[PDB]
Structure formats: structure tokens, C-alpha cells
Scaffold this active site. Structure first.
Site, mmCIF file in Angstrom:
data_model
loop_
_atom_site.group_PDB
_atom_site.id
_atom_site.type_symbol
_atom_site.label_atom_id
_atom_site.label_comp_id
_atom_site.label_asym_id
_atom_site.label_seq_id
_atom_site.Cartn_x
_atom_site.Cartn_y
_atom_site.Cartn_z
ATOM 1 N N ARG A 132 17.549 37.567 47.394
ATOM 2 C CA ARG A 132 16.773 38.558 48.152
ATOM 3 C C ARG A 132 15.771 37.877 49.067
ATOM 4 O O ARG A 132 15.958 37.811 50.298
ATOM 5 C CB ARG A 132 16.020 39.538 47.222
ATOM 6 C CG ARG A 132 15.679 40.936 47.824
ATOM 7 C CD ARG A 132 14.423 41.553 47.168
ATOM 8 N NE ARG A 132 14.598 42.564 46.100
ATOM 9 C CZ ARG A 132 15.743 43.147 45.743
ATOM 10 N NH1 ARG A 132 16.888 42.852 46.340
ATOM 11 N NH2 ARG A 132 15.745 44.036 44.770
ATOM 12 N N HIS A 188 26.376 45.077 51.174
ATOM 13 C CA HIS A 188 24.989 45.104 50.718
ATOM 14 C C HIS A 188 24.612 46.421 50.070
ATOM 15 O O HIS A 188 24.346 47.393 50.772
ATOM 16 C CB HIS A 188 24.077 44.907 51.921
ATOM 17 C CG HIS A 188 22.723 44.387 51.573
ATOM 18 N ND1 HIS A 188 22.524 43.134 51.026
ATOM 19 C CD2 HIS A 188 21.495 44.939 51.713
ATOM 20 C CE1 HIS A 188 21.232 42.951 50.823
ATOM 21 N NE2 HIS A 188 20.585 44.024 51.243
ATOM 22 N N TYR A 229 19.116 56.080 67.078
ATOM 23 C CA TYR A 229 18.878 55.937 68.527
ATOM 24 C C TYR A 229 19.381 54.659 69.201
ATOM 25 O O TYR A 229 19.650 54.671 70.395
ATOM 26 C CB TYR A 229 17.397 55.994 68.842
ATOM 27 C CG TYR A 229 16.700 57.258 68.453
ATOM 28 C CD1 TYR A 229 16.713 58.374 69.282
ATOM 29 C CD2 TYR A 229 15.979 57.325 67.282
ATOM 30 C CE1 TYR A 229 16.046 59.530 68.934
ATOM 31 C CE2 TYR A 229 15.303 58.477 66.923
ATOM 32 C CZ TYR A 229 15.331 59.575 67.758
ATOM 33 O OH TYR A 229 14.671 60.714 67.357
HETATM 34 C C1 LIG Z 1 9.985 65.617 63.890
HETATM 35 C C2 LIG Z 1 10.593 66.382 62.720
HETATM 36 C C3 LIG Z 1 9.763 67.283 61.989
HETATM 37 N N1 LIG Z 1 8.385 67.610 62.434
HETATM 38 C C4 LIG Z 1 7.234 67.843 61.553
HETATM 39 C C5 LIG Z 1 6.134 68.272 62.484
HETATM 40 C C6 LIG Z 1 6.784 68.637 63.679
HETATM 41 C C7 LIG Z 1 5.896 68.536 64.798
HETATM 42 C C8 LIG Z 1 4.999 69.756 64.829
HETATM 43 N N2 LIG Z 1 6.655 68.475 66.016
HETATM 44 C C9 LIG Z 1 7.928 67.802 63.846
HETATM 45 C C10 LIG Z 1 10.300 67.951 60.717
HETATM 46 F F1 LIG Z 1 9.462 68.740 60.009
HETATM 47 C C11 LIG Z 1 11.602 67.704 60.261
HETATM 48 C C12 LIG Z 1 12.555 66.711 61.075
HETATM 49 C C13 LIG Z 1 14.033 66.429 60.541
HETATM 50 O O1 LIG Z 1 14.435 66.962 59.569
HETATM 51 N N3 LIG Z 1 14.900 65.513 61.273
HETATM 52 N N4 LIG Z 1 16.218 65.326 60.778
HETATM 53 C C14 LIG Z 1 14.474 64.843 62.466
HETATM 54 O O2 LIG Z 1 15.177 64.070 63.032
HETATM 55 N N5 LIG Z 1 13.115 65.083 62.958
HETATM 56 C C15 LIG Z 1 12.662 64.656 64.264
HETATM 57 C C16 LIG Z 1 12.548 65.788 65.313
HETATM 58 C C17 LIG Z 1 13.707 64.809 65.386
HETATM 59 C C18 LIG Z 1 12.111 66.095 62.203
#
Ligand SMILES: Cc1c(N2CC[C@@H]([C@H](C)N)C2)c(F)cc2c(=O)n(N)c(=O)n(C3CC3)c12
Ligand SMILES: Cc1c(N2CC[C@@H]([C@H](C)N)C2)c(F)cc2c(=O)n(N)c(=O)n(C3CC3)c12
Ligand SMILES: [Mg+2]
Ligand SMILES: [Mg+2]
Ligand SMILES: [Mg+2]
Ligand SMILES: [Mg+2]
Lengths: 708, 690
Positions: free
Chosen positions: A252, A298, A342
DNA sequence: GTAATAC
DNA sequence: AACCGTATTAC
DNA sequence: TGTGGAT
DNA sequence: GGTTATCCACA
């Protein structure tokens, strides 16, 4: 946080401390809710024999265990008021589970001893294997814990069964869990009992205590780097921590001394390369790379894999980056890299060279956890990656810090040591004068560099590259253009502005980060008549504008940890390159002999083509044709097969002078290869030649300057 | 949350609204910090035309915009005391980016109208191709390619050069050309009322340095782009194979990778990354959550994915993450893919242009009805409940033989939905209604029983609950009833469900009107619910509300297409081979002169040409002849070859007939449908009543 | 208040 | 590895 | 404190 | 997609 059993019964009820929310889930589903509670442990558990009783009180996990067993902690512990007859520790049967069992037990020991003395603390053993067999609807299954128990299953079942080697609780369904580890009538347990209170105190303190030296020595002395049963606390802790220790040491946290990679890095490289995800080809979604790694090689979290992949891609941490990545892979300000969903990535061109000749049987391979694919245990390493890229570095009983180096310098040293095996440090230091951080700056301490290059430990000084700019109004301005390895630009700037705000030293007008996509620049604007050397000085002494870098060069040599210096490293590299180049040469020589043999055959065939066709026409089938070929013309099996499997069109390119050229090329090739296998000096020249070729192709200027 | 410029200057200073914390990162890194600030919008921005001004004010993203811009909101908005000269919205050049712009614009048209009327709101166009191109037209000139899927695949250096640098960036300027025609467009596309949106989409969406664009225009292109995609390529199922694209990609990808019911499970993460890298350019959470649903037998009537480990529970607790689980296709899933290797179905390129993917699977059973679908797009949504496989197949077989069948007869074979969770379905006339028009409202009610207990007390015991209902919340909601004494007589509530049965005990008190209570719980908790049919699927690239008949018809039509395609493929293989075997049979009769001719030839090319000329062989025959291995010359058995000739001919006849005769074809279809039924049939779980 | 793909 | 917000429709 | 593979 | 706690060694 806790899933309480349905009915309070201090005589039957069981408490399951489960490794992780995900397995906690399965266990919530598989339990018998009348008497079994679940209490997941979200991550590695706090070492209550190392940490301040303060931080111990503030701990989410410990607190909820003291308060669901409801018998208090410490000297104020009353066994009579407990709510469970059995506490059961249920972790993956992996080394990190081994570690968790350790941490939990050293808590129940320190702070709830009576429960351990009364044999109320058990450890559940999940099964290691599940054998087949069937197909979908008509499919059967059974479990095993001992490689022996597994051998007996293979006797039954028979053919064609298939083994599933359980990598942890995560791959079990609730039905499977219950049947094998939660059903009181089905499960195998271990009861932790204390046999000797004395022998058990020293055992727990050596392994889990704050002092490092003892533990290192315990590991040097014990770890050999090559239904219900009772185990003592001393014996269990010994065995569980022993597993964890060995594992995070060799597999590790510390790099192999030959290719300078930790196992996760080697797998990232090997996988990406198998998949042709190379510098010359299109990038490729990071998630796709990560999942292939996690599936083939892994068995750990994706974030460990991804984060590692990321670091090998940041040119302010690696001197010579091994992975190229499209998108937000972070910054010197330490902001977070985009998620693996991404970004795209590929091997850098230089990474190719770490992998060069891997197809040619040049390096030992081991089976993977599936037993479905082989993986390499060390890479061919066509440049000395340990020194060039560095490593760091925290295990059990050992940690590691090795700073990066200039590729051309490291190679120059190696080439010297190749001609001069017995070379002393003073001389190698004319070729390899010191560390070259990708972030540049100034390095001070010729003496301490020798110490480190000689013993593996040493302390040097790293200091920011600065310059003074004059401004209108008769006011000066300090400008910083390089900062010290491993320092976060953003904090540095905050911490300097803090000096101004707190007015720690007189004369600071304004701190401003002015770095842009192509260049670093922190401007420190001084006041009207500020003592400009007085400021710069205070900033060196009291912020990270200047720091101490500490060499702690530990790598894995012959399976065990080794504090090592420039010489054990370089020779280990050389020795390795030697094994490879020999292996390579053996491989190519055999491939050339086989071909040469065929070509000799084809040359004869040509002169008797007609007789041969007639003779093949005359045979009954394939085999018969070969025997007639052997018996009538003394071809060998391997030739006969070759001849008899040519496609018809081949009887047109009936050209022997061109085959004779190939024959010659091959004899000459074989002569060259034999000479390498048969003479150390010829082979070390090949090594020096290749090392030079790599230096020509990859060399770059020093970045860090040196002073003593 | 905000990254502010270095010096304050309302003449130059620019505010960048970046889609994603991640790109917000690249942005922060790539900018010119002396006058460019960065506000990452983290996730889809709130619709300020639907939500209350209550929730609109409490919003994280909205607030910090109203506070960073520092001009105040709504009617108290003085442009004069602002903080930027240009507000620049910068998203993925994808459909969801399109959506995001749409939501921002409606915020700047509703609560900062002056800002948009003075042209301070822009839209950063990032490049589509890599040199860089924006038009599929510019790409033709640059070609005398990395196709960008989002800002995320862009290095900070590249961001600056292409879309942040005032000197190199291509912007769009938002302008209001007709204040009224603009109010309508925004109110229509983004407001509470769906019907005007549906209509707008039907009438406009054809489901087939600095330029100024109108707000009516920008919102037109943007919302239509997102609308169409969300309707075709996300939320609604293909009427033929019942899959939404993510599901079809999950199956096609795992299938391509030999990850099948008869082979050991693969790590969920490995499958997911393969889907993401090869077919579906969206986030892993979506892909995995989909994979997980297809594995849960309380949501699918016939699970398509077998998953080892924690894949959730009827109690609604989170499934283990994709790093923990492993999976494979189910045996029945095999049947959805049957014959895909045989050019039975239309393929299209993937985004990467590296691989082809299928746009509909072969579908050897009628998945749409068996498993069902839900269901939320734009202007449209869908709910289609699962049905029993034997029953659906019985319906289809009757219909094959009686194309113009009425719902009433069809309901002799397909009496109504069969929920994987069982229970009681009440309402034959609403079922008929739904099967006729695709809308219908039925009642679904729990399987109850009354256990008598010691002491003159009774106990109500639940054994099945309604589809899509969370067991744990239900059990909690019943207990609330007890705890608040809304209705009287509840003694205790106990979830007694174990790993192999569902069981909820409601212990009642001595002398408590057990019917009164049971009625109360049916009405006031989800112990009993109304399920609503709203069967919408995709037929011919467009959304269609449909009942039992167009669904079955479309499936039958599809099967016809597949079987014919399949049959053409095998026949062409059989023929390519028959042709070769005729060639070999000939060759043997004249072996000696052929070896001679090849001998005389000057290379492969000339040999084939000599065979064609001297002996009237075809190319394909010549090829075969000339690539035989020498040992072949040993054989002179023309009889074994002639046996193969005969077998190929019988085979070709049987296949031709299927292509040439509709009745023959449809018999095959029926034969295969019955095999599937015989193999996978299982009994009803939900009982029916009216 | 949900449901399930998206961000 | 849970938690957090939001779009979209429909009852 | 903070470093980087781990849970 | 950011935040949140831990292990482990060594300044
Ligand atoms: C950001 C965000 C959140 N939130 C929590 C707070 C909220 C704020 C207010 N924009 C955004 C959230 F509450 C859940 C997700 C999520 O499940 N998955 N799979 C994601 O990929 N993301 C990102 C948007 C792509 C999430
Ligand atoms: C749980 C947990 C945390 N926390 C925060 C509170 C803490 C307490 C001690 N359970 C647990 C935490 F703060 C971070 C992580 C994490 O980064 N990655 N990659 C993980 O996989 N996990 C899970 C442990 C494996 C994390
Ligand atoms: Mg584990
Ligand atoms: Mg300092
Ligand atoms: Mg996007
Ligand atoms: Mg109800």
C-alpha cells in the site's frame, strides 16, 4: 445511527458492530429483529490508545457505543447494567477489517474491560469462498473458510464448479449473510478471552500506543515478510495487527525500490496500457479507466484509485508526470479536481518507457484476486523512476519521503555507477548534486544532502525564489515566483496576509495573488519607508515562504522495508535493469530461433516444391502429410506443420533470395542477442546505451537551484 | 461560494455564471482575476416562474446572485448601483446546459428586467470540436477531432483561449425585441400550466465576435432543444422494447461484455464506467441507480439485472455504492438481446463515433407491459404498470391471429396489471378505460387478515402492500395514527418482516371496532392508494398516449421486423457458404489443373484473376480456393461436401419462405412467444376485483 | 409528497 | 458513503 | 499540522 | 459534487 432490536432482553440480545454503512444495510435486512441490533462503524475507528481523552469523548462512534450498551465507560463501568449478552464484531475478512478488529478491541480493553473478561465480545468470521454450480434457475451453492474446507467442496460438486473468492461483506446478499454469519445456529464465532492480564497489556501498548520505536521492533521481530472457538486477546491482536502491518507495508504505502511505484500506481499504469490508453491515442473517460482497474486488479475504493491517478497527472507534484488528464485535475491552490465522471486521461509518453518491453516476459507476474488475469509485480522501468518522481509515504512502523530528481542527473549517476560499481557518494554527487522539485525554488544544505544521500535521512532547507520590483511613489514590492514543494499557494498567501493583518512585522501594504494560467506570482507590496529586507526575512522565518524538507527514504527491497540511500537505490535499479534486459534478450532470441528454423525449412521446400505438393496430394490427411514430410525429407515437426498449413497463394511468392536475406538477418540477430546473454560487459553497454537514449529524449533543465 | 474579481470596477468587471462546481473550478483557474468573477451554479437552477416567492427567496443560488450583483431584486432594482458590465452565462454545449440557460434567463427577465433590456446578459458559446470549431461548417474548413461533451473535458488554458478571453471569445447578447411577444414565450415555456407547454411543443418541436439574439428566440432554441431530447432520449420508453435509453445502454453494454446470467458477476463500477465511456455521456449516479432499479424485484415484475449485495430494500434504505456491488444480466434479459448479433435492429453511432449502438433491442418478450415504466419528461410524463408475462403473451398471440381484436376480448387474456408486490387491484371499468385510452385510475389495496389474540383482542396483519410504497414510512405513518389517537383502538404497530416474508402486525385494544380502524387506515395512509395509468411511450420518434392495442400492435410489428431481418441474415450466411461449397466441389474434379494454375500465377491477386478467367469461378469462390491451407489437398471426398450442400439448401428454403409468406412468418412468431411463456411464466401475485 | 433520470 | 437541492408531470 | 493511500 | 472523520509516522 443505531438500529435497535425489537424487545429489550439483556440475556439474549446481540450487538453487531458492522464495518461500513453498506454492510450495515445488508445486516439490517438479514438480522433477526427480535434480538439483534446493528450499529455500523462509518470508516476506520479511533485509536483510543493514542488519542487525547478529549477527542475520544467528542467521537460520534465511541459515544454511541457507550450509550447503546448503556453501562457507562471507564472505571464507572457496571457489567450488570449492560443491554446485550453478546457484542459481535463483523468486518470484511480483508486486512483493513483485520485493522478495525484491532482498534475496537483496544477500546473494549482500555474502557470496558469487564465485558472482555466475561467473554461477551466475539468476532464473526464471514466465509472466504462460495463454490458453484449450475446455471441461472438450476444453480446450487455452498460456502467454505479454510483452503482445506474448500478442497473438500471441490470433491463434491465436481465439474464444472466455479469458485467465488469473497473480497469482503459488500458482495453478500442479506439472505447469504444471515445463513453464514448471523444465524446463531449456523455461524462460526471467536470468543475473545483474556488468558494473562500481564502479557495482554504489553501486547496492546506495543502495537497501538503512541511510541513508534517499540512497534517497529515488534514488526521486525514477528512479521515474516517471507463452530465457536476461543482466542486470547494477546494472540488475536498479534495476528490481526500482524496482517494489517505486513500488508500496508509491502502492498500500500511504500514504493518498490526498483520502479518507484506503489501497487496502486503500478496497476493504474498496467491497466491503462493493456487498454491501449496511451499518449499517441485519444483520451478516455477517467471513470472507464478507474472501473477497469477496480474490476481487474485493485480491490479498493474508486476514490483511492482516482485520486492516485490524478496526482500522477499534476505537474507540480510529479517531476515527470506519468498520466495526462483533460480538464480540472486541481491546482497549486489545492482546490478539488473534477470527479472521475468529468475528466479524460491517458498515459504520458514517458510512462510508456516504464512499461517498455512488458510483453516480452521480462518481469515476474502474479495472479489477480479473481484469478482471471495476471498482473506484473514490478515494471520494466526504463528510467529510474524512484528518484526522478519521488514518493511519500505513511505505513505502520515506517513512513517514507523521497524528493523528486532531475532525470538527466539521475541517469548520469546510474551510468557512472554502471562502469564503477564501488563508487562512493562524494563522486556520484558530481553527477547527482541534489533534489530538483517540479515547483523549483532554492535548496540549501550541501552537507545535509550528503547525509541523506548516505543514510536515507537528512534535513534540507527550501526557500522561495523572489525578486524586488520598484514602484512609483518610492515604494518597493516583493515578488514571489517559485514556492517550496508540497506547499499550498492559497494558504501561503492567506498566512502572509495574516502577518500583515496582525502587523507581525512592519511595512506590509498589501498581499495579492497574481498568478495566471501561465505563471506564478505573489506580489507583496510594501509601504512608504519599509525595511524591505526586514520583511522578507520575517516571512521566511515565520511562514512557509521557506520550510524544512526532510528526507526519509524508505522503499521495499526484497519484500521488506529498508531505509536506503543513493547507492542501494541506484544499484537496485541497475540490478533490476539487468534481470530485464537479460529476460528480454532470451525472449527475442527464442522467437528468432523458431522463425529461423521455419525459414530454413521453407528454403529447402522451395527447391523440391513439386515433389512436396505431389507428396501432400498423396497423403490421406493432415497428420499423414506431416509424417510423410518428416520421413521422406527429414523435416522436423515444427517445419512440417509450417509447410502443411501455408495457404495456396503462397506457392506464387516462390522467392529464395529474399528468404535467404531473412535467414541472414536472423543469424545476425541471434548472434547479437547471444552475446548479451553470455557476457556481463556487452550487456551493461546495452544498458548504458539505452539509458542514454532516454536521457536524450526526455532531459530537461534543473528547476531548483542549489546552495550550501 | 463566490470567487470575486481583484479590483472593483462596474465598467469592466464581468460575472461568470458557470454550470457545475467542477467547471467553476476550471473557470476560476483560467480567468483574468483582475476583473472576472466566478459563481458556480451547482446543479439545475430553480424555476422562478413556478415556485413560490417564498422558496425563491430561500434559494442558495438565487440569493448569492442577488447579493454579488448588489442591485437588489424585483421592483427595487436600480441598475445604476450594480457591480458588473457583463453577466455571462457559461454552460456545457449540451441539452442540460440549454435548460440551465433557460432557467437563468427567466430569472433575469422576471426579477432584473432592466439588466436584460440594457443588454448586460450574455451567453458564452464554448467550442464543439478540436484547432477549434463551433459550426459543423467550420469543421470542414479546419479539416483542410475531439468532439467536446462538456466544459469538463477542457483544460483551463483552453477555456481561456476559446471562451473567456474578451479578445478570442464568441458571445451572444440577450436583447428584448418585443416586450410582449417575450412575456408570452417565457410564461408559456416556464410557467405552472402544462397544457400550453405540451401544445407549444407539438406545434414547434420537429421530432423529425458578438451577435445579438432576441429573448423570444434564445428561449425558443434553448427550450426546444432540451424539450425534444428529454422527450426522445431520456424519460420515456420506446413503445417496442419498453426501455429508456439508459436502460438499453446498460443492457447492450453488459451484454457486449459477456456479463451474462451464466457467467460470474462483475464489479458494478466496471460495468458503469464501460457504459459511461462507450455509450451514455452522463453521470455515473444516474447510470448506477438505473442498473440498481432493474435489479430490484419489488419494482420490476421481471428483473433484468442480478446484483450481489446491498441493492436496497422495500424499506427504502440506500443501496450500497457501485464500489461494493457486483452484477450481471438476468436470464430473461438475454431474451431482450436475442439475435442482436444478426443485424436485426437499427444501429447508430455513439457520441465518440468509435462504436455503433442499437436504438431498440430485439425484444423476444413484450417488456413494456411486463415491466412497465415511469415517467417524467417535459409536457409529458408516463406511468405504465407491470403485467404478468404469461398473460401479456396470451394477448399478443390472440392478436397476431386476430389483428382487429377489441379490448373486451383482449381482457380475457390480459385482465389487468400484475404488481411484483402483489396486493389487491380494484376497478375493472377503470382498467378497461385505461386499456382503451391509456388513462385510467384504479385502486390498489393491501392484503389483510385478522388474527384473534388472547384476551378478546384482534390483530390486523398485512402481508402485501401497494406498488411503489415504502414499507418503513408506511409503518411509521400507521404508528402516528396510534400515537395521535386520530381514530381509536390501536394497541401497537410492529414490522415483523424478515428476510423471507413481509408482515406488519397491528395489535388492537380490547373491544375496538376493527373495521372502523381498517377503513380509517385505508383512507388516511398508503395502506391503500390510487394508482393512475398514464401510458405514454415513444412511437416513431414522438410521444404518444396509447392503450393496450397500439402497444401490442407495435410489438407485433417490431417482432415481424426483427424476424424478417434475422431470417435475411442467416440466409445470406447460408448462401455465402453454399456458393463456396459449390466452388470446392468443382475444384476437386479438377484439382490437378488448379494447383497448376495457381503455380503459374504471379501472386494472390493474379491467381484469383486466373481462376475467374480460366474456370468461371466467382471472386468469393476464388478467394476461398486460394486461401486454402495445403493439407486440404489431401481430401477428395465430394460426398461429405454434397451432404453439406443439401443441408444448406433445406435451410435456405425454410428461411426464404419466412421472408416470402406472412402466415409462415407469424406462425414462427407465435411459436417463439409460446416458448418464452413456457420458460418464464409465473403465477399472478395481485388479485382482481371491481 | 412522490416517482426516476438528469444536473 | 450519507446529506443536501433542484427540474419535469400528475394525482 | 499535513502529507497520501486506505475505510 | 463539496463536506465531513478516521488510521498511520514524522517534522
Ligand atoms: C450538487 C448536488 C446536490 N446539491 C446539494 C445542495 C445543492 C445546491 C443548493 N445547489 C446542490 C445534491 F443534494 C445531490 C447531488 C447528486 O446526487 N449527484 N449525483 C450529483 O452529481 N450532484 C451534483 C449536482 C451535480 C448533487
Ligand atoms: C464515512 C466517511 C466520512 N465520515 C464522516 C464522519 C465519519 C464518522 C467517523 N463515521 C465518517 C468522511 F468524512 C469522508 C469519507 C470519504 O472520503 N470516502 N471516500 C469514503 O468512502 N467514506 C466512507 C468511510 C468509507 C468517508
Ligand atoms: Mg473491505
Ligand atoms: Mg518557514
Ligand atoms: Mg453536461
Ligand atoms: Mg390511502
Amino acid at each position: 445511527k443505531l438500529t435497535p432490536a425489537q424487545s429489550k432482553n439483556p440475556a439474549k440480545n446481540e450487538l453487531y458492530l458492522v464495518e461500513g454503512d453498506s454492510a450495515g444495510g445488508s445486516a439490517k435486512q438479514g438480522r433477526d429483529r427480535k434480538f439483534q441490533a446493528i450499529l455500523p462503524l462509518r470508516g476506520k475507528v479511533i485509536n483510543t490508545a493514542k488519542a487525547k481523552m478529549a477527542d475520544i469523548l467528542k467521537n460520534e462512534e465511541i459515544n454511541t457505543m457507550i450509550y447503546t450498551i448503556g453501562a457507562g465507560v471507564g472505571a464507572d463501568f457496571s457489567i450488570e447494567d449492560a443491554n446485550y449478552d453478546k457484542i459481535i464484531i463483523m468486518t470484511d475478512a480483508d486486512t483493513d477489517g483485520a485493522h478495525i478488529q484491532t482498534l475496537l478491541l483496544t477500546f473494549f480493553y482500555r474502557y470496558m474491560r469487564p465485558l472482555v473478561e466475561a467473554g461477551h465480545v466475539y468476532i464473526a468470521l464471514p466465509p472466504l469462498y462460495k463454490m458453484s454450480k449450475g446455471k441461472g434457475k438450476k444453480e446450487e451453492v455452498a460456502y467454505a473458510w479454510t483452503d482445506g474446507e474448500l478442497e473438500e467442496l471441490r470433491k463434491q460438486f465436481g465439474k464444472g464448479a466455479t469458485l467465488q473468492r469473497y473480497k469482503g461483506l459488500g458482495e453478500m446478499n442479506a439472505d447469504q449473510l444471515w445463513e453464514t454469519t448471523m444465524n446463531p445456529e449456523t455461524r462460526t464465532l471467536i470468543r475473545v478471552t483474556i488468558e494473562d492480564l500481564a502479557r495482554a497489556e504489553r501486547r496492546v501498548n506495543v502495537l497501538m500506543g503512541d511510541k513508534v520505536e517499540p512497534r517497529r521492533k515488534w514488526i521486525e521481530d514477528n512479521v515474516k515478510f517471507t463452530n465457536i472457538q476461543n482466542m486470547s486477546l494477546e494472540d488475536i491482536m498479534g495476528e490481526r495487527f500482524g496482517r494489517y502491518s505486513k500488508y500496508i507495508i509491502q502492498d500500500r504505502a511504500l514504493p518498490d525500490i526498483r520502479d518507484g511505484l506503489k501497487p496502486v500506481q503500478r496497476r493504474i499504469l498496467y491497466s491503462m496500457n493493456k487498454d491501449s490508453n496511451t499518449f499517441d491515442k485519444s483520451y478516455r473517460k477517467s471513470a472507464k479507466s478507474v472501473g477497469n482497474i477496480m474490476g481487474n486488479f485493485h480491490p479498493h475504493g474508486d476514490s483511492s484509485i482516482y485520486d492516485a491517478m490524478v496526482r500522477m497527472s499534476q505537474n507540480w507534484k510529479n517531476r515527470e508526470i506519468l498520466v495526462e488528464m483533460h480538464g480540472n485535475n486541481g491546482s497549486m491552490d489545492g482546490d478539488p479536481p473534477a470527479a472521475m465522471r468529468y475528466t479524460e486521461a491517458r498515459l504520458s509518453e514517458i510512462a510508456g518507457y516504464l512499461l517498455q518491453d512488458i510483453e516480452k516476459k521480462t518481469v515476474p507476474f502474479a495472479w489477480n484476486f479473481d484469478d482471471t488475469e495476471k498482473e506484473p509485480t514490478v515494471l520494466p522501468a526504463a528510467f529510474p523512476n524512484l528518484l526522478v518522481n519521488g514518493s511519500t509515504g505513511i505505513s505502520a512502523g515506517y513512513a517514507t519521503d523521497i524528493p523528486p530528481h532531475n532525470l538527466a542527473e539521475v541517469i548520469d549517476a546510474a551510468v557512472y555507477m554502471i562502469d564503477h560499481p564501488t563508487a562512493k557518494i562524494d563522486k556520484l554527487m558530481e553527477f547527482l548534486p541534489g533534489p530538483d522539485f517540479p515547483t523549483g525554488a532554492i535548496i540549501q544544505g550541501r552537507d545535509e544532502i550528503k547525509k541523506a544521500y548516505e543514510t536515507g535521512k537528512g534535513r534540507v532547507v527550501v526557500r522561495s525564489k523572489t525578486e524586488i520590483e520598484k514602484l512609483k511613489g518610492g515604494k518597493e514590492q516583493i515578488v514571489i515566483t517559485e514556492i517550496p514543494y508540497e506547499i499550498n499557494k492559497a494558504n501561503l498567501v492567506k498566512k502572509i496576509d495574516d502577518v500583515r493583518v496582525n502587523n507581525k512585522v512592519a511595512g506590509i501594504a498589501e498581499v495579492r495573488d497574481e498568478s495566471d494560467r501561465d505563471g506564478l506570482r505573489i506580489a507583496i507590496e510594501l509601504k512608504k519607508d519599509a525595511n524591505t529586507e526586514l520583511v522578507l526575512n520575517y516571512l521566511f522565518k515565520y511562514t512557509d515562504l521557506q520550510i524544512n524538507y526532510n528526507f526519509n527514504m524508505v522503499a521495499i527491497d526484497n519484500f521488506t522495508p529498508r531505509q536506503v540511500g543513493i547507492v542501494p537505490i541506484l544499484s537496485s535499479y541497475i540490478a533490476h535493469r539487468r534481470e530485464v534486459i537479460l529476460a528480454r534478450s532470451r525472449f527475442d532470441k527464442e522467437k528468432a530461433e523458431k522463425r529461423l528454423h521455419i525459414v530454413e525449412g521453407l528454403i529447402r521446400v522451395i527447391s523440391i516444391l513439386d515433389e512436396v505438393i505431389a507428396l501432400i496430394r498423396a497423403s490421406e490427411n493432415k497428420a499423414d502429410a506431416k509424417e510423410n514430410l518428416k520421413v521422406s525429407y527429414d523435416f522436423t515437426e515444427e517445419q512440417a506443420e509450417a509447410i502443411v498449413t501455408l495457404q495456396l497463394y503462397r506457392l506464387t511468392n516462390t522467392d529464395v533470395v529474399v528468404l535467404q536475406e531473412e535467414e541472414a538477418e536472423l543469424r545476425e540477430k541471434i548472434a547479437m542477442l547471444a552475446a548479451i546473454i553470455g557476457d556481463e560487459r556487452t550487456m551493461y553497454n546495452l544498458m548504458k546505451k539505452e539509458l542514454r537514449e532516454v536521457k536524450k529524449k526526455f532531459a530537461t533543465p534543473r528547476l531548483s537551484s542549489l546552495e550550501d
